[PDB]
Amino acid sequence: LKSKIESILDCIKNSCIDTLYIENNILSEIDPKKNVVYFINSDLFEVKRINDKEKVLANIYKAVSSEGCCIKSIITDKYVRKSFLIAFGGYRKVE
RNA sequence: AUUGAAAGUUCAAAGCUUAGAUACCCUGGAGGGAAACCAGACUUAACAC
């Protein structure tokens, strides 16, 4: 599956269509400090077999919660932890 | 120094009378209130350890 996903991802990246319509001068490069856009990174595509969907969904909280006992066991110092989630877990209410 | 001299074409007189800018005549024909748009984003805090 990871191979199939990298296949489709690469296909559109270089092999497929081309820069044909990106050469049109209607696009507009983003301002770096006033804009935020997202894009796919081919490297970050972990795949694991499930065997149980409900428990997986319930463990996502262990993954993404600052006090979840999976990121606690993968990251310490807690600060980067907050940082990590704040940079990768959407908005959070820090004050 | 004459086929001359003298002699007001003058007077009275309403461009008036009758007479409908009227008759017939569709603001109508054609024309998409549409086009675009995620009911979504995210967990945090406390103390115990």
Side-chain angles (χ1 to χ4, degrees):
Chain A
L1 181 61
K2 192 175 182 193
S3 70
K4 281 148 163 56
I5 298 178
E6 294 322 303
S7 177
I8 173 60
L9 204 155
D10 190 339
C11 179
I12 311 155
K13 259 193 310 180
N14 57 8
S15 75
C16 188
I17 43 174
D18 61 303
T19 321
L20 74 173
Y21 54 66
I22 324 171
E23 293 311 277
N24 189 8
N25 265 313
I26 192 66
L27 298 161
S28 178
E29 147 79 12
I30 63 166
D31 172 282
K33 298 157 159 270
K34 296 161 232 151
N35 287 36
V36 167
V37 300
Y38 298 164
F39 43 97
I40 303 177
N41 193 333
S42 189
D43 203 350
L44 284 301
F45 272 86
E46 291 66 4
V47 185
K48 297 294 167 46
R49 178 180 305 270
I50 288 280
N51 297 164
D52 186 293
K53 296 163 177 312
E54 289 67 20
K55 195 33 66 186
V56 164
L57 290 156
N59 306 149
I60 303 308
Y61 186 67
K62 322 187 167 165
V64 311
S65 178
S66 74
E67 200 52 33
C69 76
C70 285
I71 179 153
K72 181 69 81 67
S73 67
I74 295 164
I75 289 177
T76 58
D77 178 76
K78 100 194 153 187
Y79 287 138
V80 300
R81 190 156 71 240
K82 306 305 291 186
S83 299
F84 178 70
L85 293 182
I86 284 189
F88 296 93
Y91 167 84
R92 268 132 163 86
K93 185 67 177 177
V94 62
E95 195 273 322

